[PDB]
Amino acid sequence: MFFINILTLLVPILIAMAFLTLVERKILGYMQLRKGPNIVGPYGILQPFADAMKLFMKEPMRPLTTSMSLFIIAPTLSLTLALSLWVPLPMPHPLINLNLGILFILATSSLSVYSILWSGWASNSKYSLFGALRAVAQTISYEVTMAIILLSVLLMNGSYSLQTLITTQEHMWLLLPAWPMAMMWFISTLAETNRAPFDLTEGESELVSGFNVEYAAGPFALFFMAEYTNIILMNALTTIIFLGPLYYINLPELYSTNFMMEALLLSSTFLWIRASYPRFRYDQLMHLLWKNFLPLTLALCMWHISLPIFTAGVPPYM
Amino acid sequence: SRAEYVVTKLDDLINWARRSSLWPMTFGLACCAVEMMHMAAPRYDMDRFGVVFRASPRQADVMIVAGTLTNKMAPALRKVYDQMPEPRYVVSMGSCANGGGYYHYSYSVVRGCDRIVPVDIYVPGCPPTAEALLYGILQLQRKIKREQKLKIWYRR
Amino acid sequence: AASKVKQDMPPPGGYGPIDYKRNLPRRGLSGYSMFAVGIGALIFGYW
Amino acid sequence: MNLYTVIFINILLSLTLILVAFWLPQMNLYSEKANPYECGFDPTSSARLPFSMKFFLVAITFLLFDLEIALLLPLPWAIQTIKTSTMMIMAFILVTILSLGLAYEWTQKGLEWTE
Amino acid sequence: TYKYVNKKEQESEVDMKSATDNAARILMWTELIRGLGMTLSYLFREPATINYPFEKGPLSPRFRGEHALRRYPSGEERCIACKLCEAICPAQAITIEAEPRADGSRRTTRYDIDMTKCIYCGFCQEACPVDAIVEGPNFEFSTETHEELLYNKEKLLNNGDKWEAEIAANIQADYLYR
Numbered sequence: 001m002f003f004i005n006i007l008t009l010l011v012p013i014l015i016a017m018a019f020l021t022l023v024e025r026k027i028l029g030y031m032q033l034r035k036g037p038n039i040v041g042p043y044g045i046l047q048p049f050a051d052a053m054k055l056f057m058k059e060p061m062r063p064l065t066t067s068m069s070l071f072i073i074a075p076t077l078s079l080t081l082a083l084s085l086w087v088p089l090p091m092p093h094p095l096i097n098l099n100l101g102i103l104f105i106l107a108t109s110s111l112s113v114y115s116i117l118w119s120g121w122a123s124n125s126k127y128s129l130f131g132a133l134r135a136v137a138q139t140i141s142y143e144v145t146m147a148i149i150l151l152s153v154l155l156m157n158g159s160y161s162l163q164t165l166i167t168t169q170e171h172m173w174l175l176l177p178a179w180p181m182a183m184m185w186f187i188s189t190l191a192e193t194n195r196a197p198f199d200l201t202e203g204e205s206e207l208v209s210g211f212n213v214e215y216a217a218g219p220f221a222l223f224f225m226a227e228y229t230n231i232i233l234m235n236a237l238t239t240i241i242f243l244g245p246l247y248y249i250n251l252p253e254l255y256s257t258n259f260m261m262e263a264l265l266l267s268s269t270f271l272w273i274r275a276s277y278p279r280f281r282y283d284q285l286m287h288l289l290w291k292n293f294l295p296l297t298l299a300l301c302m303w304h305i306s307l308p309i310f311t312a313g314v315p316p317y318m
Numbered sequence: 319s320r321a322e323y324v325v326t327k328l329d330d331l332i333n334w335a336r337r338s339s340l341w342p343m344t345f346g347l348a349c350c351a352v353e354m355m356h357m358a359a360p361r362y363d364m365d366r367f368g369v370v371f372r373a374s375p376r377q378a379d380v381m382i383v384a385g386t387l388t389n390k391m392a393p394a395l396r397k398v399y400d401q402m403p404e405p406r407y408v409v410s411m412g413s414c415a416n417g418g419g420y421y422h423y424s425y426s427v428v429r430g431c432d433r434i435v436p437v438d439i440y441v442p443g444c445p446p447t448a449e450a451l452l453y454g455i456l457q458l459q460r461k462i463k464r465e466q467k468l469k470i471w472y473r474r
Numbered sequence: 475a476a477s478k479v480k481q482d483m484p485p486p487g488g489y490g491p492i493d494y495k496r497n498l499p500r501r502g503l504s505g506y507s508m509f510a511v512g513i514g515a516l517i518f519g520y521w
Numbered sequence: 522m523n524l525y526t527v528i529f530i531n532i533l534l535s536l537t538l539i540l541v542a543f544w545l546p547q548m549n550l551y552s553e554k555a556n557p558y559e560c561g562f563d564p565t566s567s568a569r570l571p572f573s574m575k576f577f578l579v580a581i582t583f584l585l586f587d588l589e590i591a592l593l594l595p596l597p598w599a600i601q602t603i604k605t606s607t608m609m610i611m612a613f614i615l616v617t618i619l620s621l622g623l624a625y626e627w628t629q630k631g632l633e634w635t636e
Numbered sequence: 637t638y639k640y641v642n643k644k645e646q647e648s649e650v651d652m653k654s655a656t657d658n659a660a661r662i663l664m665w666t667e668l669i670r671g672l673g674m675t676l677s678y679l680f681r682e683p684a685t686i687n688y689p690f691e692k693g694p695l696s697p698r699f700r701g702e703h704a705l706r707r708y709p710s711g712e713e714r715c716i717a718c719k720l721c722e723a724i725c726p727a728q729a730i731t732i733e734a735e736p737r738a739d740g741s742r743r744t745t746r747y748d749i750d751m752t753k754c755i756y757c758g759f760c761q762e763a764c765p766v767d768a769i770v771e772g773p774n775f776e777f778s779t780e781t782h783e784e785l786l787y788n789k790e791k792l793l794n795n796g797d798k799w800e801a802e803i804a805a806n807i808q809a810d811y812l813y814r
């Protein structure tokens with residue numbers, strides 16, 4: 001039965017990645033006064049399959065300057081982790097109940113960067129190396145605030161488990177007490193994915209494609225789908241932590257429904273933002289995260305350390 | 319359940335994919351690049367057809383030679399084309415690219431991009447109306463509709 | 475009938491007046507309002 | 522065992538995709554195609570040379586900040602303790618010293634990049 | 637006259653209200669929310685995208701696209717081999733060879749146009765004193781071969797015999813403006 005559950009958790013995520021590429025294109029088109037794919041199928045529901053099939057039908061590249069081992073490992077790892085981050089998620093019941101699920105998320109995400117690093121290094125092209133170093137800077141920038149934001153939120157949950165947030169929000173979202181932390185977490189998830197305005201790892205206007213510039217159809221598809229999967233993942237994280245779906249033990253289907261609605265909202269917001277803003281300079285990202293988010297993050301961490309004490313609202317350990 | 323029929327349908331599918339997803343390359347040399355843009359614009363939405371400008375040749379499927387090709391630029395054009403992975407198509411846009419055009423008798427112009435790379439479709443004009451470039455894209459789509467590769471493999 | 479000179483000339487009295495200056499409007503709350511809303515939300519959530 | 526199962530399933534999915542991407546399509550390999558990409562022209566050098574880093578100090582600092590995060594993470598448990606005043610005081614001291622170090626770096630222009 | 641774009645700034649006066657407004661702008665991301673609102677407004681507008689190749693972009697009679705040699709309503713050719721068209725063609729795309737037709741008239745044997753050299757400028761149809769060579773409206777004449785784009789007398793004559801119903805009307809419309 002567990003393998004069937006694996007399927008019911010995996011194949012829909014990939015279909016959703018594909019139709020997320022679709023929704024991205026169509027939303028950006030209508031924002032840009034254009035339509036977006038409507039030719040390939042009814043309103044374009046076959047463009048993703050066309051793209052994927054076409055890519056996995058193309059000649060891949062085995063250049064002469066590359067370390068083929070890492071060149072091939074990196075996309076494998078990217079996709080693997082993009083799919084593995086979805087397992088401990090409660091919707092409302094997870095496939096793998098982990099007590100330290102938050103830390104699993106953190107570590108797997110911090111690991112997904114090495115796909116970019118090793119790809120850009122192996123490719124042995126200057127633009128690839130530039131994308132890799134930009135990823136290094138981006139991680140060094142956001143990873144400090146990520147964990148402190150998350151700790152400050154969890155100090156009212158009582159644990160690193162993703163299933164106690166459901167009982168924590170049983171009456172009221174965690175956005176009201178933590179909307180500053182929610183905003184900073186939103187932007188930091190925006191950065192974790194190398195997504196606009198932080199699309200610096202593949203900045204087409206400075207670096208033709210970054211770490212992808214030597215990669216070709218299949219591996220490139222792997223990278224791309226990993227990106228568009230981590231997008232949905234981080235939206236789901238935002239909407240399990242700060243937004244709380246209705247949990248009535250006799251009605252988990254409503255929980256899944258509302259979870260999906262909120263995830264769609266947050267993802268469409270990601271696309272909105274890509275369409276609405278220019279791109280940062282990768283030094284300004286560091287300056288932001290280290291001069292506006294980290295000081296405030298420490299202040300709020302102290303605030304949420306104290307609040308349970310001068311309120312007697314310390315959470316329980318299971 | 320004839321294998322020849324199955325192969326014809328499979329080839330239809332292959333071509334449908336490679337056709338409804340044509341990612342060109344951000345390679346514009348001269349005026350004709352403006353009409354390329356305008357064909358990317360709302361009135362003529364490229365993505366509507368599955369067309370997407372990717373900047374890396376290792377990800378592109380077709381290159382539109384959108385303007386004049388000088389002798390100082392031909393090596394780079396041939397290199398980029400060489401770096402595009404098969405299946406790879408080419409589209410000559412304008413009169414400069416087809417036969418040098420208004421600069422045919424110049425000392426610094428190749429009298430046709432068809433000397434440096436092989437061209438599938440020629441789009442005439444100076445500049446070609448974006449509508450015409452789209453007509454050419456669809457002409458290419460049909461040419462791909464008529465590749466019949468696996469049938470050939472089965473007949474070998 | 476006859477034939478006078480015909481030419482794409484403007485209409486008598488001229489064309490309507492054209493707007494060319496910036497009109498980025500002014501909107502939003504008062505600032506105090508934003509901070510009060512946020513602080514009240516924090517306090518209710520804490521309770 | 523189930524976590525192992527899921528993760529290995531994902532490994533196998535990715536590897537299957539890569540296999541059928543490397544063995545399904547028709548190839549035509551030659552040097553001018555397999556050569557590095559530097560915007561149409563030939564590289565003037567190798568990409569394996571020192572690429573100077575202007576945020577080295579910020580990265581070093583990031584190491585220590587990661588450690589301070591590691592020390593802050595046990596709070597969810599430290600708040601279940603009877604000695605609450607001690608936990609409060611120690612957490613406040615830790616975060617304050619962290620902020621003071623950051624402020625000293627800021628002022629002495631460590632967070633700014635070498636040019 | 638002149639105006640300033642970024643010197644408007646005058647001496648600094650600051651209150652608590654102004655400080656708080658700038659603080660909210662810096663903390664709640666006011667100015668970015670407005671770009672979000674603009675992009676939202678555009679999502680609920682009608683896209684300017686036409687449904688090509690079914691509905692097409694507008695044009696005017698003066699449009700100068702594909703070339704064609706016309707005829708008089710009797711069927712006789714209008715060209716008389718005067719060679720202004722090739723004398724002015726700034727791309728040297730036209731090539732002509734004349735000879736006395738058996739009936740004695742002055743007519744061509746060769747009339748070639750390298751449509752890879754034509755810049756579609758229109759000088760030939762404003763030079764032709766008999767309105768023989770024109771630049772028709774057709775622009776959907778792409779090819780799969782370079783050779784197909786090297787027109788001769790027969791190709792241009794066939795185009796003229798194919799578009800006359802349109803070329804003639806566009807002329808009738810535009811010939812007073814010339």
Ligand SMILES: CCCCCCCCCCCCCCCCCC(=O)OC[C@H](COP(=O)(O)OCCN)OC(=O)CCCCCCCCCCCCCCCCC
Pocket residue numbers: 179180182183184186187197238242273277288292293296300303512513516662663664665668
């Ligand atoms: C008694 C109370 C006790 C509790 C204590 C807390 C009290 C409340 C305190 C509230 C503080 C406000 C919330 C903090 C978040 C904002 C942080 C911030 O202001 O950063 C501003 C930063 C710098 O902006 P700049 O104009 O360049 O100024 C530079 C300095 N001279 O620039 C930025 O960081 C923002 C730029 C980011 C641009 C990226 C794109 C943003 C997209 C916007 C999407 C908005 C949607 C939000 C969705 C959230 C849902 C989860």
Ligand SMILES: CS(=O)(=O)C1CCN(c2cccc(Cn3cc(-c4nc(-c5ccc(OC(F)(F)F)cc5)no4)ccc3=O)c2)CC1
Pocket residue numbers: 014015017018021022024025028029048049051052053055220221222224225365370372
């Ligand atoms: C000027 S703009 O603002 O309009 C600008 C905005 C951005 N934009 C855009 C956005 C999203 C996608 C694309 C097309 N595109 C698709 C892929 C790629 N997709 C898949 C893939 C694999 C499996 C899938 O599911 C299944 F097959 F079922 F497994 C589905 C897909 N692999 O690679 C890679 C590169 C790429 O550009 C384009 C349009 C233009």
Ligand code: SF4
Pocket residue numbers: 348349350384385386411412413414415419420443444445446755
């Ligand atoms: S054909 Fe005409 S429009 Fe196109 S690049 Fe040449 S001169 Fe410019």
Ligand code: SF4
Pocket residue numbers: 721724725726727728729730749753754755756757758759760761771
């Ligand atoms: S339109 Fe201009 S360039 Fe073209 S054939 Fe006529 S005169 Fe020559």
Ligand code: SF4
Pocket residue numbers: 714715716717718719720721722732760763764765766767768769
């Ligand atoms: S200008 Fe007209 S009449 Fe004279 S040679 Fe050219 S086509 Fe013939």
